Amino acid sequence: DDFKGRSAEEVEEIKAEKEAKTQAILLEMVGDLPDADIKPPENVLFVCKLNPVTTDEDLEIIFSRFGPIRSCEVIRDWKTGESLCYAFIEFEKEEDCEKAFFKMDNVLIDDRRIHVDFS
Amino acid sequence: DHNIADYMTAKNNVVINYKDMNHTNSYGIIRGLQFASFIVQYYGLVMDLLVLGLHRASEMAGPPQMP
Amino acid sequence: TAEEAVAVYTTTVHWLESRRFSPIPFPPLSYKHDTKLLILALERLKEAYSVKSRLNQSQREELGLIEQAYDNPHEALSRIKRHLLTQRAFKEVGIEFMDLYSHLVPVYDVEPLEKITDAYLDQYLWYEADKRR
Amino acid sequence: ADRKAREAVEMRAQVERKMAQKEKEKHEEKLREMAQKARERRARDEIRHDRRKERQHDRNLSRAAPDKRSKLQRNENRDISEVIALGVPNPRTSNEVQYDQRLFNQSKGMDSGFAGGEDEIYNVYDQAWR
Amino acid sequence: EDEWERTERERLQDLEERDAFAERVRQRDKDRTMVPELRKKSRREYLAKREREKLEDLEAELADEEFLRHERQELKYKRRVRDLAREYRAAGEQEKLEATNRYHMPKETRGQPARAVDESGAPGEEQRRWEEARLGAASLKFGARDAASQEPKYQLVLEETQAQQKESIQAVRRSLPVFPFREELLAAIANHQVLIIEGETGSGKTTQIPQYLFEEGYTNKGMKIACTQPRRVAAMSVAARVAREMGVKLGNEVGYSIRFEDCTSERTVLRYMTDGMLLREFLSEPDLASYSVVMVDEAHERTLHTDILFGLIKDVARFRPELKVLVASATMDTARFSTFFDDAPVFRIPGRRFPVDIFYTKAPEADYLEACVVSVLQIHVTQPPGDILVFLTGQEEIEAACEMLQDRCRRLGSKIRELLVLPIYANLPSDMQARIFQPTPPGARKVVVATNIAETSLTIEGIIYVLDPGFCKQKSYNPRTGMESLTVTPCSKASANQRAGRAGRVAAGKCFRLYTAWAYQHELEETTVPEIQRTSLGNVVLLLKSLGIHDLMHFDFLDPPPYETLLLALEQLYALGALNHLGELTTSGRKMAELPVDPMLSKMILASEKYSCSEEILTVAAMLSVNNSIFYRPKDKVVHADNARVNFFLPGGDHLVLLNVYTQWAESGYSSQWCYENFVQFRSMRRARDVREQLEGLLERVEVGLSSCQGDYIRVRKAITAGYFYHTARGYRTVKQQQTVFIHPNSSLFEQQPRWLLYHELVLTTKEFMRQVLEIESSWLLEVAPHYYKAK
Amino acid sequence: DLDRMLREQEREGDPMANFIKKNKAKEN
Amino acid sequence: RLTLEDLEDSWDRGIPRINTLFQKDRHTLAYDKGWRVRTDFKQYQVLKQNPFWWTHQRHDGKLWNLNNYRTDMIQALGGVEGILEHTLFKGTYFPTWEGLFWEKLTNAQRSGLNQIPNRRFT
RNA sequence: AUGAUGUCAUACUUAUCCUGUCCCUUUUUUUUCCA
């Protein structure tokens, strides 16, 4: 049967899900993400839009006010070690990671409004 | 487009004059129009579909990708 | 009657659906081939007055309109598209007859501005129908 | 009739689209099996990795700074053919047919040689007599 | 002028301090400026962006690997998987395409119709398209297509070293005429640091001399060797030839840096750039510590920026103890360059030449367009090998020469074979230019009629017979009248000598002089006037003042520019908002000199944010920054090209027309087919796009935001009038210089003569013309520059 | 135009050229 | 490339008439569609009747050449001297026939017969 | 009771006058991204 008769926003979110499904299928075709469902591990926060003079321990101490983080790792340069202003913070709980990521945007850390998302 | 077809139809509904006679052409087509040949061949296409039927005309024209 | 016209309309709709026909749009504001179609229509209209005879007032008026459209094609194309968009009532047409001594042939006489507009419409419609098959 | 025809055409189009959509999905499934053939396939390398890292940094710079994407977009393949001919030693192929220019413009004119009817205008011969 | 370099260096550190203060102001302004649903949104954006980024980068990495057993297997796997992804996206696009191609009978729409989504291959395919139409009308075949059955089909019985390529590359490199002279050349390099090198072209000096310096090991500590060029395309050719001599890809140790194209990946030993580049790192770096040896292009172009580079290199040779700088040359007029560089040594290199015996006409004539055609035909009836080049001095007579030669060639049939005629312009689309570089047919005696592109820039093979009428156009500017004339003049003797050098490049030349040898010996000048005397210097007076030089009238040069040109340039910069009461550059003058276009055009940017609408006048300045002419006016056609020009017309001058051209080129895919269908050159307006991109990138350094009005074209014309107050004229007469004016026929306001108007340029060719006019009312004319404007 | 005529006769119907083409097809 | 000698033999052959491929105005002639019907409905518009309603010299090409007819008619009438014996050529006292060459106002009538060319023919 | 004001047309004057216009070359910097 045809799928017609739903709402317009329902058609929009179904088409967006189809676009994301075809993107995930194409990434499975290429082999950059050879897993099927393609799911990142939780309690991991990706931090970007910052300055390269930040510290991992100071970022963990700042993030521990809204939930404790198990570890942190800044994605620096593979040849020179210069900071690429991107990092992954591995938390202990997913709710602590969500509470840390819900109160981290638009905060001038090292004179830069860093953004926190998933990885 | 509907504006084009409205011009096509309204061009044929004019007044024919000769000396002291005037009459409004409301039924026939006027062959003196510059675009009258297109209307004649399109109406003849409709009559070809009436004569041949749809199946034999589609067989004669072939598929639309390879006419 | 009623059902004959409905059957004709339905058969035409089914035939155009079967051929995957794309409908002819309006002539756009910046068409690629509008000047070439205007040149072809003006040559087609200038075909009949190549004898350079004594003519009359109406033929000289038509030839002057052809030359005015030839000098300024953009204003002529704008006037043609304005006539296609707006006007639905037209001037009267003259009729006469050619005696071919076995039968008579009707000859119609049209105002030259409408002749220019109809010639451009004929060229555009035949080019679009040939391109869209 | 117009309204009825509209609905009929629309519903027919939907049905056709649905079956074509199914065919596309079938092809995707078949090529997903070909992806497992990629799993049957992959079951100056450091210089290439450094070039890939430099290209990724250039792509991130072009994402951060809105401009043309280095030589891949500003030069690209649609460059000016002068620097393709001179500054690049790699040329490209050419289509169409070359002709002599001397065979090219013997006849001119917009219209046919019969000016409507125009019976009394001589012109029964093409060239002059002598 | 060591104190000049110290002052220049000090101005560079205070420019860095002003840049740091403006940067600190920029971050001051910047700082002063559900959970699974958010996870699904983040994953949707992340996999969409990463999928399109990896799909973009993968074929770029495959192309980089192609330019550079297990690796072959990995490359085969990568090629197969990118082909698989490409056909997967093609299948999805095919599904959307068959969803598009339906009947869909039209809805009755109230109001005016709207243009929907449209195409095919437009440039050059209409000829083969109409050939296919004639073939379809001509081919006749009966019966069904299936007719291969009942065929017995009888058959005929019949009867029962890659290292050698590199060694050939060094053999070709050792076949140069500089190869016996290289040891004495490096000895003279070790002797003096200011050595001038002369030699006629074809010797391969500019490719082998930095090469022989590279095996001399002058770049050992990381100080790279630099070679400048007068034009970008010749720099591309020289860098490509050196890179193919070395087998090393560009961006590496053989690399280039020109405008919008810097292929240097920080490993570049042999850096090839233009003179504007070397002025730009003079404007950034005070001393060439990163450059060991600078190779200088030939001075026979007499380019303005090369003369500025000559003055700065003389200042460096005063300042630095050594740089081993060296200047190339063509002819024997190196005594002035030697005496300019403190009795510099001159080293001559012979080149491969041929007898290019100059013929003569024993009559003075002033026609040179029928006699040149008769000369072409009389060359075509004598000796069969060779190609013919004819020099001319403008577009409008060389198209008439092409038409006359084509009409004379079509008048003969089997008599007189081939003779294909190809013209050269600067405002020619690149397909007709690239048709020249194709080899000639074996039955042809290919004629390339040309302007001075083949004399100066382009090198074309196979030419033997060369005509020369001895006329070229000069862009002469008169500062006493404030008027610039492009007028045809007789040439120079050195120009005729380089024309004869271009004549017999491959074989024995037969250069036909088109006037008397007495006028060549006596009436003809022997020296070409350089650029700085002919033209105004309003662009580069600000460049010299931005580099700390205050003695502009006492600056070192090969020859001094006239004082009236400097007086009018300083008076204009007084009228512009860049000079103080003491003739000193302001911080607004630093904003004037940041972005590199002309200051009279760069007052658009300082007029922006005073009337908003910054992006519109940015694109207006992008079309006013072009070199070649916009719009295509071909031989014949005319009416379609004129209608395509009229279709872009807007009230208020042609600046809004050019803005409309860039606006309609936007939201069109930036396609070449749109520019071909609208008679717009797709060589000159891509340059306008690149200029607009560079000026958009150079907007934080001037600190001007991306502002727009979307309808307030009165604000756009007010910002233009704020930028253009000096260039006004009304009353069929200049309002200041009292010189009569005439409207150009190619302008959008040739008819409907205005009440008040400004302009951009005042080129005199036949009448005193009117280039790039714009409608004003002289109401906001008094609102800007009140010192210049008084009493209506 | 004798040379162009011999060129046209070498580009004519020419069963010899068909023999040459089929011999190069069968040999290679 | 395709040379002049490739198509010099087949220049005036073919029903679409090969030389029509190399007309000057062929690019704007590529957009002319449906012109046979324009002639066959131009009989309803133009008063005079066209005998060449079925062809077009730019599209179809010049389908006939009658240049040999004049030469053979001059030969069949007895040559140029045999023709000129019938005329008043000897009365004109011209030395030879090879140099021979022929030829906004209001008016009461203009549809009358022009008697001057009939007088010079007589 | 006759003054100003508007491209609206029609008369009128000067022994007014039958008329002309499309550029050679070309050069000008710097900074981030996911198992």
> What string of DSSP letters covers F1-28?
-HHHHHHHHHTSS-HHHHHHHHHHHHH-
Q: Phi and psi for E718 in degrees, rounded to 5?
A: -70, -40
Question: How many angstroms separate the CA of residue A36 from the nearest CA in chain E?
Answer: 13
The distance from CA E360 to its chain's CA centroid, rounded to whole angstroms, is 36
Nucleotide closest to D62 measured between CA and C1': H32
DSSP string, A45-85: EEEES--TT--HHHHHHHHTTSS-EEEEEEEE-SSS--EEE
Residue G86 neighbours by CB distance under 10 Å: 9
Amino acid at E424: I
Q: Report the sign of the C-alpha dihedral through residues E261, E264, E270, E276, in that order.
A: positive
Nearest-by-Cβ selection for E677 from C22, C32, C39: C32
The enclosing H or E element of E272 equals strand E270-274
Pairwise CA distance, residues E724 & E602, whole Å: 10
- Binning chain C into helix, strand and coil, the percentages to the nearest 5 are 60, 10, 30
- For residue C104, give the amino acid letter: L
Interface of G with F (CB under 8 A): 5, 8-9
Q: Determine the straight-line distance between the first and last CA of chain A, rounded to whole angstroms.
A: 38
Report the Cα–Cα distance between both ends of chain G, in Å, rounded: 57
Beta strand ranges found along E425-514 (DSSP E): 447-450, 463-468, 471-478, 483-490, 512-513
Choose among E314, E293, E332: nearest CA to E189: E293
Tell which residue, G97, E162, E502, E323, has the closest CA to residue D130.
Answer: G97
Query: Which residues, at least 6 apart from E122, have a Cβ–Cβ distance to it below 8 Å?
Result: E673, E676, E677
Name the residue among D106, D112, D129 with its Cβ closest to that of G56: D112
CB E98 within 8 A of CB C20: no
Interchain contact F1–G (C-beta under 8 A): yes
Neighbours of C37 (CB within 10 A): 26
Collapse the DSSP code of E80 into the 3-class scheme (helix H, G, I; strand E, B; otherwise coil) and give the result: helix
Breaks in chain B (C to N over 2.5 Å), named by the residue before each, are: none
Q: Does E101 touch chain B (CB under 8 A)?
A: no
Chain CA centroid to CA E775, Å: 30
Cβ atoms of E721 and E756 within 8 Å: the answer is no
To the nearest 10°, the Cα dihedral for E246, E250, E255, E258?
140
Instruction: Please give, one letter per residue, the 3-state secondary structure of E701-767.
Output: CCCCCCCCCCCCHHHHHHHHHHHCCCCEECCCCECCCCCCCCCCCCCCCCCCCCCEEECCECEECCC
Q: How many CB pairs under 8 A join C and D?
A: 29
Contact E647, C74 (CB under 8 A): yes
Q: Cβ contacts of residue D12 below 8 Å, gap of 6+? A: C17
Contact, E593 vs E705, CB < 8 A?
no
Query: Helix, strand, or coil here: G106?
Result: coil
DSSP code of residue G86: T
Resolution of the experimentally solved model in angstroms:
3.1
* E204 labeled part of a ligand binding site: yes
What residues of chain B, 7 to 46, have a C-beta less than 8 Å from chain G? 31-32, 34, 36-38, 40-41
**Inter-CA distances, E163 with E166, E176, E214, E243, E253, Å:** 5, 21, 22, 17, 22
Torsion of CA E167, E173, E177, E181, to 10 degrees: -90
d(CA A114, CA A51): 8
Give the CA dihedral E456, E766, E572, E659, nearest 10 degrees: -80
Give the CA count within 13 Å in the CB-facing half-sphere of D104: 20
Pairing between β-strand E346-348 and β-strand E196-198 as defined by DSSP bridges: parallel
Q: For residue D9, what are its two tokens?
A: 């055409």
**b/e map of E488-506 (b: 16 or more CB within 10 Å)?**
eeebbbbbbbbbbbbbbbb
Note whether E505 and E549 are within 8 A (CB): no
> H or E element: which one contains E91?
helix E70-100
Q: What is the dihedral of CA E87, E89, E94, E99, to 10 degrees?
A: 160
Q: Which residues of A touch D15 (CB under 8 A)?
A: 2
Q: What is the rounded distance in angstroms from the CA atom of residue D30 to the CA atom of residue D32?
A: 5
Task: Give the three-class secondary structure for E430.
Answer: helix
Nearest residue to A20 via CA among A8, A31, A28: A28
Q: State the CB neighbour count (10 A cutoff) for residue E716.
A: 25
What's the token pair of residue G77?
């009438």
Question: From CA D36, how far away is CA E444, in angstroms rounded?
Answer: 59
Interchain CB contact of E106 with B (< 8 Å): yes
Residue E198: enclosing H or E segment and its boundaries?
Answer: strand E196-198
CB C16 within 8 A of CB E102: no
User: How far is Cα E534 from Cα E484, in angstroms, rounded to an integer?
Assistant: 9
Contact D125, G68 (CB under 8 A): no
- Please tell me the distance from the alpha carbon of residue E452 to that of residue E231, in angstroms, as a whole number: 14
C-beta of residue E388 within 8 angstroms of C-beta of residue E447: yes
Show me where chain F is broken: residue before each gap, C-N > 2.5 A.
Answer: none
How many helices (DSSP H) and strands (DSSP E) are in chain D?
4, 0
Q: Alpha-carbon distance E223 to E228, whole Å? A: 16
CB contact under 8 A, G25 and D100: no
Q: Which residue of chain D comes nearest to G100, CA vs CA?
A: D130
Q: Give chain H positions with protein CB within 7 A.
A: 21-35
Element (H, E) at E209: helix E205-214
Nearest to E717 by CA among E783, E774, E663: E774
Is residue E201 a known part of a binding site?
A: yes
Q: Please, what is the Cα angle at E545 between E541 and E548, to 5 degrees? A: 150
Sign of CA dihedral D33, D36, D37, D38: positive
Q: What are phi and psi of G16, to 5 degrees?
A: -80, 5
Q: From the list D5, D12, D121, which residue is nearest C10 (CB)?
A: D5
Å between CA of E693 and C1' of H27: 18
Closest CA-bearing residue to C1' of H20: E767
Residue E214 CA, distance from chain mean position: 30
Three-state DSSP state, C70: helix
- Torsion angle defined by CA atoms of residues E320, E326, E329 and E333, in that order, rounded to the nearest 10 degrees: 50
- Which residues pair with residue E224 across a beta bridge? E291
The backbone torsions φ and ψ at residue A90, rounded to the nearest 5 degrees and listed phi first, read -90, 115
Using the Cβ of C26 and the Cβ atoms of chain B, whether some distance falls under 8 Å is answered with yes
Give the pairing type, strands E254-258 and C104-109: unpaired
Please give the distance of CA E405 from its chain centroid, rounded to a whole number: 30
Using DSSP bridges, classify how beta strands E763-764 and E483-490 pair: parallel, antiparallel or unpaired.
Answer: parallel
Give distance CA E770 / C1' H21 (Å): 12
Per CB-CB distance under 8 Å, the chain G contacts of F4 are 5, 8
Please count the residues of chain F: 28
Q: How far apart are CA G115 and CA G92, in angstroms?
A: 22
Residue partners of E373: CB distance under 8 A and separation at least 6: E401, E404, E405, E408
Query: How many C-alpha atoms does C111 have within 13 Å on its Cβ side?
Result: 13
Interface check for F12 against chain G (CB to CB < 8 A): the answer is no
Distances (CA, A) of E171 to C73, E177, E211, E270, E606: 64, 12, 15, 22, 58
Local structure of B30: helix, strand or coil: coil
**Rounded Cα gap, residues D24 and D16, in angstroms:** 13
Helices C112-131 & B36-52 angle (0-180, nearest 10): 40
Distance A40 CA to H34 C1' (A): 10
Query: E56 to each of D55, D63, D69, E86, E262, how far by Cα in Å?
Result: 11, 12, 11, 11, 22
Give CA–CA dist E144/E317, Å, rounded.
86
